Amino acid sequence: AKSAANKLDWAKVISSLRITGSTATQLSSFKKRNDEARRQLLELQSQPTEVDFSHY
């Protein structure tokens, strides 16, 4: 799941505070969040491919 990944991600953001050079490290993390969130809405969008040839 995403939640293991995200706990480690946001914890690492608050660790990234304690250094500087996370200039685009955090931007890579944001991108990883984006596409992760994209698959989750993807999985919610899906309908079974075949028509319901029972009714329709």
Next chain:
Amino acid sequence: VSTLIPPKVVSSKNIGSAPNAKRIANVVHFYKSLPQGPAPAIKANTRLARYKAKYFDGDNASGKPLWHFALGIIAFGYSMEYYFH
């Protein structure tokens, strides 16, 4: 996308910190200091390191050597008074 690798290299918070200058100082200063010393007062040892020990220690500013040395000069010219008499 994959988190960047700058945080996995450190060699600019390890040499890039101000107390490093103090560290290399106080590893030399303190490590190489004998915790205790030899003896505070000992100059003129011939039973006159004892004179120093009683009078010229930093444990006293007592007026006794002053008195003693003064009395010496009184003894010096006074004896010579009776030598010149």
